[PDB]
Amino acid sequence: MERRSLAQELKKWAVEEMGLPAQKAPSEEMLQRLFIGQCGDIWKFIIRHIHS
Amino acid sequence: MSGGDRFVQTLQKLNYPKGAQLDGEDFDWLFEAVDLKPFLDWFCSAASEQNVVPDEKLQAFNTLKESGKPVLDEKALDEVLKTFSISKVPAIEEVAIEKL
């Protein structure tokens, strides 16, 4: 359940905060793959410390 | 340059704390996924050092938000900051009784 939630936050971060066009944004299902293993901690960092 | 090496370089630029220990070859698999590749490429291009807000400034800003003080919008900040001469005008040390 945790991966799905992070995948949504990343999507929101990419679209709302960094300005990625919604059309180019990968499906939530596809973003979940980025939170596999050590990549998860990395993207958590990105969502928190990296802003527009 | 393997997609993975680019990603790890970007992370180093973004001051990720464990970035020096990460080997690029370990992430080459992320770029093999034809569907995610465009996003990762985007990310590695879009994210620079100017985008990074240290944990200290974020905490300070949250504290400012919590302090009930109105957060000035970009337009307002531009107006007020214009009025700011870069020059170190030493904080008017309010004429410390000492100055008087």
Curated annotation (Swiss-Prot), chain B:
Top-rank lineage group of the source organism: Eukaryota
Localization (cell): Cytoplasm, Cytoskeleton, Microtubule organizing center, Centrosome; Cytoplasm, Cytoskeleton, Spindle
Q: What does this protein do?
A: Contributes to mitotic spindle assembly, maintenance of centrosome integrity and completion of cytokinesis as part of the HAUS augmin-like complex.
Family membership = Belongs to the HAUS3 family.
Subunit composition and interactions: Component of the HAUS augmin-like complex. The complex interacts with the gamma-tubulin ring complex and this interaction is required for spindle assembly.
Instruction: State the protein's name.
Output: HAUS augmin-like complex subunit 3
What organism is the protein native to? Xenopus laevis
